């Protein structure tokens, strides 16, 4: 069965360097072509380089010179030295076995990230999302949770402990300035709350951060 | 070098369709042993992306037979003759006939289904952010279709163009709709200087903005 494990990815400062692996199974780096290929946090695919069974070796403009690609056949595990790094470098990295001169991605592993960043661990700022007296005038109600500037990703938000499942849209985190932001809108009827406790729960792993922020009604 | 371009970037389609996808070179791509390494990739949320069409037409082993791919010159196609829920998910280009290998920026197949009408909430800034200083107002736009849409913000009645932060959700699972949250970050000083804010949203469903908005002191 062919396998294809990528690692080593990871957190890095710019300008840093990183070293990536390429640990591959079911055949042979000498009969297959190997290369590396990044997407990017806007789902942007993009060839980082490649490495022939007969070992020719090929790099963008943009990748040359930054990063190498070497590769060890007895051990068969791909690598991938990265230096001069940049925010851009910023993606998730896939070692992809090809057909030579027959198909260039065949393959691919699921892949190691790698995050450029100077930001350091930082917990992030829960805040309750009361709606305003205007918006409170109808059948349904909206809360929502605003969950600013942490580091790293990611953090974990429910409502009520999970409890709290239906209506519920949490907002893809957002780069507000080296720190990401993430908001969680949730949607009940008038009649569920405040009448019934809604809370936003929300954790951040890297920090040891777990807060708890429930919503009140505004007003004096 | 050669760059693709992939048409549209997002595709609605319903459950049976026949769909056409397609992919523009800059330039003809032939390698010089007179191969044409144009190929096609599905990537499923939260997977990897596995090939589908290798060499213009040649579909990969394994992949169902409602895909097939086909073109010549600049201009290259993938069907799905008959699409299926499995099928939904980001088709991605790519030509590795001349260095540098480029691919395409993808073709976003999603759901089809009614337009919707986005419901909008605004909320001011929480006590307990303005006691620490800031003061970050959001708003959100929630459960529309189709997934275009336009937010404006106003402070006293001023459009304000700087300092917003927009975040979609792909489309709902459950629903179909998308929503999309807005975060205008202000300093507590700031936001003290105004009285009025604003959230606007345009969607095909309203031409005339659906206004949401509070005043500092009342409501
Ligand atoms: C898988 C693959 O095999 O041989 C090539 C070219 C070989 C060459 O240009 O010298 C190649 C060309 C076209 C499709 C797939 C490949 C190659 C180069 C690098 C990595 C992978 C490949």
């Known amino acids: 069965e062919v396998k294809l494990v990528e690692s080593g990815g990871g957190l890095v400062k710019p300008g840093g360097s990183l070293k990536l692996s390429c640990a591959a199974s079911?055949?042979?780096?000498?009969?297959?072509?190997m290369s590396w290929v990044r997407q990017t946090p806007e789902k942007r695919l993009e060839w980082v380089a490649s490495?022939?069974?007969?070992?020719?070796?090929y790099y963008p403009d943009s990748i040359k010179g930054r990063f190498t690609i070497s590769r060890d056949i007895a051990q068969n595990i791909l690598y991938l030295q990265m230096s001069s790094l940049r925010s851009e470098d910023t993606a998730m990295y896939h070692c992809?076995?090809?057909?030579?001169?027959?198909?260039?991605?065949?393959?691919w592993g699921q892949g190691t990230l790698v995050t450029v960043s100077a930001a350091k661990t930082t917990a992030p700022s829960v805040y309750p999302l009361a709606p305003v007296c205007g918006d409170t005038t109808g059948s349904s109600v909206t809360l929502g949770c605003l969950v600013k500037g942490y580091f790293p990703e990611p953090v974990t938000l429910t409502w009520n402990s999970g409890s709290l499942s239906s209506g519920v849209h949490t907002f893809p985190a957002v780069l507000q300035s080296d720190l990401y932001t993430l908001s969680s809108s949730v949607t009940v009827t008038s009649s569920t709350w405040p009448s019934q406790s809604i809370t936003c729960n929300v954790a951040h792993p890297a920090s040891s951060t777990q807060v708890d922020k429930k919503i009140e009604p505004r007003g004096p | 070098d050669v760059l693709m371009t992939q048409t549209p970037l997002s595709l609605p389609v319903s459950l049976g369709d026949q769909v056409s996808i397609f992919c523009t070179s800059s330039?003809?791509?032939?390698?010089?042993?007179?191969?044409?390494?144009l190929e096609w990739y599905l990537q499923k949320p939260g997977q990897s992306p596995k090939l589908l069409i290798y060499?213009?037409?040649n579909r990969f082993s394994g992949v169902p037979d409602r895909f097939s791919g086909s073109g010549s010159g600049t201009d290259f196609t993938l069907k799905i003759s008959r699409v299926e829920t499995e099928d939904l998910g980001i088709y991605y280009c790519?030509?590795?006939?001349?260095?540098?290998?480029?691919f395409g920026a993808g073709t976003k197949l999603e759901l089809k289904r009614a337009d919707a009408a986005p419901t909008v909430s605004i909320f001011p800034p929480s006590s307990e952010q303005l006691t620490s200083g800031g003061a970050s107002v959001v708003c959100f736009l929630n459960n529309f279709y189709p997934k275009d849409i336009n937010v404006k913000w106003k402070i006293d009645g001023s459009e304000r163009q700087n300092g917003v932060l927009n975040s979609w959700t792909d489309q709902d699972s459950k629903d179909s709709t998308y929503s999309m949250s807005s975060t205008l970050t202000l300093t507590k000083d700031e936001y003290e200087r105004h009285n009025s804010y604003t959230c606007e949203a345009t969607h095909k469903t309203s031409t005339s903005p659906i206004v949401k908005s509070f005043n500092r002191n009342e409501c």
């Open positions: 330039q003809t791509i032939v390698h010089t042993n007179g191969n044409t390494y």
């Open positions: 060499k213009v037409s």
């Open positions: 992809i076995r090809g057909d030579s001169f027959l198909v260039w991605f065949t393959f």
């Open positions: 790519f030509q590795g006939s001349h260095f540098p290998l480029a």
């Open positions: 079911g055949f042979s780096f000498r009969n297959y072509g």
């Open positions: 490495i022939s069974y007969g070992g020719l070796i």
